[PDB]
Design an enzyme around this catalytic site. Structure first.
Site, PDB file in Angstrom:
ATOM      1  N   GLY A 176      11.938 -56.579   9.569  1.00  0.00           N
ATOM      2  CA  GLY A 176      12.459 -57.770   9.112  1.00  0.00           C
ATOM      3  C   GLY A 176      12.263 -58.885   9.795  1.00  0.00           C
ATOM      4  N   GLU A 177      12.533 -60.115   9.250  1.00  0.00           N
ATOM      5  CA  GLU A 177      12.566 -61.344   9.828  1.00  0.00           C
ATOM      6  C   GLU A 177      13.892 -61.863  10.760  1.00  0.00           C
ATOM      7  OE1 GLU A 177       9.337 -64.464   8.437  1.00  0.00           O
ATOM      8  OE2 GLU A 177      10.214 -62.889   7.280  1.00  0.00           O
TER       9      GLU A 177
ATOM     10  N   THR B 142      16.004 -64.364  13.366  1.00  0.00           N
ATOM     11  CA  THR B 142      16.613 -65.697  13.515  1.00  0.00           C
ATOM     12  C   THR B 142      15.107 -66.529  13.943  1.00  0.00           C
ATOM     13  OG1 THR B 142      17.359 -65.306  16.161  1.00  0.00           O
ATOM     14  CG2 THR B 142      18.748 -65.746  14.153  1.00  0.00           C
ATOM     15  N   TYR B 143      14.334 -65.552  14.453  1.00  0.00           N
ATOM     16  CA  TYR B 143      12.788 -66.061  14.808  1.00  0.00           C
ATOM     17  C   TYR B 143      11.874 -64.945  14.899  1.00  0.00           C
ATOM     18  CZ  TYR B 143      13.431 -65.018  19.999  1.00  0.00           C
ATOM     19  OH  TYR B 143      13.546 -63.997  20.994  1.00  0.00           O
TER      20      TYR B 143
ATOM     21  N   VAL C 293       9.351 -61.520  14.185  1.00  0.00           N
ATOM     22  CA  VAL C 293       9.239 -60.650  13.108  1.00  0.00           C
ATOM     23  C   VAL C 293       9.312 -59.095  13.874  1.00  0.00           C
ATOM     24  CG1 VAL C 293       7.890 -59.198  11.399  1.00  0.00           C
ATOM     25  CG2 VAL C 293       7.701 -61.764  11.693  1.00  0.00           C
TER      26      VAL C 293
ATOM     27  N   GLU D 271      14.846 -51.146  22.760  1.00  0.00           N
ATOM     28  CA  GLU D 271      15.297 -49.707  22.528  1.00  0.00           C
ATOM     29  C   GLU D 271      15.559 -49.574  21.055  1.00  0.00           C
ATOM     30  OE1 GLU D 271      19.348 -48.471  23.483  1.00  0.00           O
ATOM     31  OE2 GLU D 271      20.047 -50.612  23.056  1.00  0.00           O
TER      32      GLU D 271
ATOM     33  N   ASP E 225      20.338 -51.784  11.242  1.00  0.00           N
ATOM     34  CA  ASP E 225      21.434 -52.862  11.163  1.00  0.00           C
ATOM     35  C   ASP E 225      22.531 -52.584  10.432  1.00  0.00           C
ATOM     36  OD1 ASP E 225      21.069 -54.621   8.877  1.00  0.00           O
ATOM     37  OD2 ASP E 225      18.998 -54.631   9.346  1.00  0.00           O
TER      38      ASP E 225
ATOM     39  N   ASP F 165      25.393 -66.735  16.310  1.00  0.00           N
ATOM     40  CA  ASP F 165      25.009 -65.952  15.022  1.00  0.00           C
ATOM     41  C   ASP F 165      25.520 -64.581  14.700  1.00  0.00           C
ATOM     42  OD1 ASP F 165      24.090 -66.517  12.529  1.00  0.00           O
ATOM     43  OD2 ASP F 165      22.060 -66.152  12.946  1.00  0.00           O
TER      44      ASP F 165
ATOM     45  N   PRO G 233      26.603 -59.518   9.900  1.00  0.00           N
ATOM     46  CA  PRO G 233      25.988 -57.862   9.949  1.00  0.00           C
ATOM     47  C   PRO G 233      24.535 -57.685  10.412  1.00  0.00           C
ATOM     48  CG  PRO G 233      27.751 -58.658   8.174  1.00  0.00           C
ATOM     49  CD  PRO G 233      27.421 -59.686   9.105  1.00  0.00           C
TER      50      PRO G 233
HETATM   51  O1  LIG Z   1      17.310 -55.854  14.943  1.00  0.00           O
HETATM   52  C1  LIG Z   1      17.298 -56.857  15.352  1.00  0.00           C
HETATM   53  N1  LIG Z   1      17.465 -58.011  14.532  1.00  0.00           N
HETATM   54  C2  LIG Z   1      17.339 -58.767  15.061  1.00  0.00           C
HETATM   55  N2  LIG Z   1      17.424 -60.303  14.484  1.00  0.00           N
HETATM   56  C3  LIG Z   1      17.775 -59.845  13.083  1.00  0.00           C
HETATM   57  C4  LIG Z   1      17.312 -58.811  12.501  1.00  0.00           C
HETATM   58  C5  LIG Z   1      17.951 -57.549  11.953  1.00  0.00           C
HETATM   59  C6  LIG Z   1      17.415 -56.548  11.464  1.00  0.00           C
HETATM   60  C7  LIG Z   1      15.799 -56.827  11.373  1.00  0.00           C
HETATM   61  S1  LIG Z   1      15.688 -58.487  11.855  1.00  0.00           S
HETATM   62  S2  LIG Z   1      16.372 -58.761  16.691  1.00  0.00           S
HETATM   63  C8  LIG Z   1      16.650 -57.267  16.357  1.00  0.00           C
HETATM   64  C9  LIG Z   1      15.840 -56.236  17.550  1.00  0.00           C
HETATM   65  C10 LIG Z   1      16.062 -54.761  17.353  1.00  0.00           C
HETATM   66  C11 LIG Z   1      16.425 -53.791  18.310  1.00  0.00           C
HETATM   67  C12 LIG Z   1      16.700 -52.534  18.056  1.00  0.00           C
HETATM   68  C13 LIG Z   1      16.658 -52.051  16.514  1.00  0.00           C
HETATM   69  N3  LIG Z   1      16.613 -50.797  16.535  1.00  0.00           N
HETATM   70  C14 LIG Z   1      16.684 -50.128  15.149  1.00  0.00           C
HETATM   71  C15 LIG Z   1      16.534 -51.220  14.121  1.00  0.00           C
HETATM   72  C16 LIG Z   1      16.155 -52.470  14.535  1.00  0.00           C
HETATM   73  C17 LIG Z   1      16.131 -53.017  15.568  1.00  0.00           C
HETATM   74  C18 LIG Z   1      16.047 -54.240  15.961  1.00  0.00           C
END
Ligand SMILES: O=C1N=C(NCc2cccs2)S/C1=C/c1ccc2ncccc2c1
Ligand SMILES: [Mg+2]
EC number: 2.7.11.22
Lengths: 257, 300
Positions: free
Chosen positions: B13-14, B16-17, B19, B83, B88, B129, B132
């Site tokens: 997913g996207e 806050t900035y 991908v 990691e 989420d 920010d 969930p």
């Molecule tokens: O999950 C992350 N989310 C970030 N910002 C918004 C988003 C939530 C979900 C997709 S985009 S940065 C970020 C990094 C990250 C780190 C570890 C993870 N482990 C599993 C799944 C997603 C992960 C994302």
């Protein structure tokens, strides 16, 4: 005043880690303290032209000082390092930082947009992306809370003096930001009201007038010799009514300490 | 290590900035998350959100804050390597739609989120920010604060910072009414909204605009006056025309919650930024006396 105590502890722990190499300038083949002084003075002007926060300027100098602790730089490239560091400092601290084009413009076409961008990458790589450094400014604003009561003249003068410390690597590169801020705050407090380093700031910092003295001796000298100094941007800056014209005030003849 | 050693698996997913991708290290077998930032498109060099996220995430070192493994630094693109946890929280609430999240797991999560946030605040970091989508859970009952793109290193005392801050639904009243200064309290407000959301199974204040957001808050917590919020009527975006609503019963707002839970929640959503509970003080609250660490269930 719930996190204020452990934030101060953390910052006091971090200023030791984000500290530049004490005598890095001796190991620099092509640049001297004088050149650095010109560079920082020019950065002060940039901050005035673009109405940048004091914090941004203090960060830029830290970035420059750490960069020069590990990288040799020729004199004709020193302004590029300063520009990229001011740009990074702005992106970190400013709500509306100037765009890259504006940073290219203030170098008088000596460097291209490409060069400033590549240098931004290099600074980041060398600083290893650690930009949240403690500064004199950060410790000052914390000390200002201990004014009995709040005085606008003292605040501006403490900022002016703390700022002067950035210009001269010799000696101020050997003191921690918290010490300089302490010395600056006391010096501003003595000059305007006659009051001294408060009791509450002894409890908070573990610094006494005796422990601050070395830095406080140098800072008194820099203050007295300020109209002589080859660099004048800081003095011109603090002429303004925004800072209550604190640079025009007469410094005390002696500290009596 | 270079991008050559990473195999992209899926686009998640996207942020806050940038991908976010799930990826696999071809040499070690380790599953990581990658945050891809394109330095093209916007020729302003490395963006400030990346600069702030990287530097703050490198300082922050806590079991309830996502771990940044590496930063890969091309002249083309910039990758952040994290990691890989599981999922989420937004996705977890979707997976648990039919059954809901059990109260012991809600208690556990809020507790860990408060621990991460406290560590954040004690290191002069505002998240700004919390929602969930920006919180990550693993398969063994842990939760972690993620996405520090809109985070800020703050000073004591604070200056005026960016005013855009926080996803609308989770935005504190002091930002909405356009106060000069805001601080750690805005992170607390967001957690409170998240806490209620997990319990009620729907968002607490799902406003469409700024003004609709305020009115939804006013309806539930009562319209603020001088007694509850000293100086509220003088704030820039306050209007004399605001409906003087009465505070409604909290056992009606959040039914499944015990007396302890209502007490904490009403303190996390206090109008006055000064009187709003800190993350540190919220850890002491009796609500967390019998806290356990349950695993999450995700397939029913
Ligand atoms: O999950 C992350 N989310 C970030 N910002 C918004 C988003 C939530 C979900 C997709 S985009 S940065 C970020 C990094 C990250 C780190 C570890 C993870 N482990 C599993 C799944 C997603 C992960 C994302
Ligand atoms: Mg030399």
């Amino acid at each position: 005043p719930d996190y204020h105590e452990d934030i101060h502890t953390y910052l006091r722990e971090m200023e030791v880690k984000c500290k530049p190499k004490v005598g890095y300038m001796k190991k620099q083949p092509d640049i001297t303290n004088s050149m650095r002084a010109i560079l920082v003075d020019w950065l002060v002007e940039v901050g005035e032209e673009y109405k940048l926060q004091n914090e941004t300027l203090h960060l830029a100098v830290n970035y420059i000082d750490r960069f020069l602790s590990s990288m040799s730089v020729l004199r004709g490239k020193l302004q590029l390092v300063g520009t990229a560091a001011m740009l990074l400092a702005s992106k970190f601290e400013e709500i509306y930082p100037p765009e890259v084009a504006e940073f290219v413009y203030i170098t008088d076409d000596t460097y291209t947009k490409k060069q400033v961008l590549r240098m931004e990458h290099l600074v980041l790589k060398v600083l290893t992306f650690d930009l949240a450094a403690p500064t004199v400014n950060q410790f000052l604003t914390q000390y200002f809370l201990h004014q009995q009561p709040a005085n606008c003249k003292v605040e501006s003068l403490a900022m002016f003096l703390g700022e002067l410390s950035l210009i001269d690597a010799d000696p101020y590169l050997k003191y921690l930001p918290s010490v300089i801020a302490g010395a600056a705050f006391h010096l501003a407090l003595y000059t305007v009201t006659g009051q001294s380093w408060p009791e509450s700031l002894i409890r908070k910092t573990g610094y006494t007038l005796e422990s601050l003295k070395p830095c406080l001796m140098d800072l008194h000298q820099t203050y007295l010799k300020a109209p002589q100094h080859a660099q004048q941007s800081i003095r011109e800056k603090y002429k303004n009514s925004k800072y209550h014209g604190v640079s025009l005030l007469n410094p005390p003849e002696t500290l009596n300490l | 290590g270079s991008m050559e050693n990473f195999q992209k698996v899926e686009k998640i997913g996207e942020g806050t900035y940038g991908v976010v991708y799930k990826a696999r290290n071809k040499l070690t077998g380790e599953v990581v998350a990658l945050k891809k930032i394109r330095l093209d498109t916007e020729t302003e060099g490395v963006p400030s959100t990346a600069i702030r996220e990287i530097s703050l995430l490198k300082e922050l070192n806590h079991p309830n804050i996502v771990k940044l493994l590496d930063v890969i630094h091309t002249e083309n693109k910039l990758y952040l390597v994290f990691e890989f946890l599981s999922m989420d929280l937004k996705k977890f609430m979707d997976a648990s739609a039919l059954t809901g999240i059990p109260l012991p797991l809600i208690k556990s999560y809020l507790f860990q989120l408060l621990q991460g946030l406290a560590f954040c605040h004690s290191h002069r970091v505002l998240h700004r920010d919390l929602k969930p989508e920006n919180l990550l859970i693993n398969t063994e009952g842990a939760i972690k604060l993620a996405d520090f793109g809109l985070a800020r290193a703050f000073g004591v005392p604070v200056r005026t910072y960016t005013h855009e801050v926080v996803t609308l639904w989770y935005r504190a009243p002091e930002i909405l009414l356009g106060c000069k200064y805001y601080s750690t309290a805005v992170d607390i407000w967001s957690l409170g909204c998240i806490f209620a959301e997990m319990v009620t199974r729907r968002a607490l204040f799902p406003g469409d605009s700024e003004i609709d957001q305020l009115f939804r808050i006013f309806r539930t917590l009562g319209t603020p006056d001088e007694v509850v919020w000293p100086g509220v009527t003088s704030m820039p975006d306050y209007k004399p025309s605001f409906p003087k609503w009465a505070r409604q019963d909290f056992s009606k707002v959040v039914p499944p919650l015990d007396e302890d839970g209502r007490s904490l929640l009403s303190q996390m959503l206090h109008y006055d930024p000064n009187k709003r509970i800190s993350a540190k003080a919220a850890l002491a609250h009796p609500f967390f006396q019998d806290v356990t660490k349950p695993v999450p269930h995700l397939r029913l």
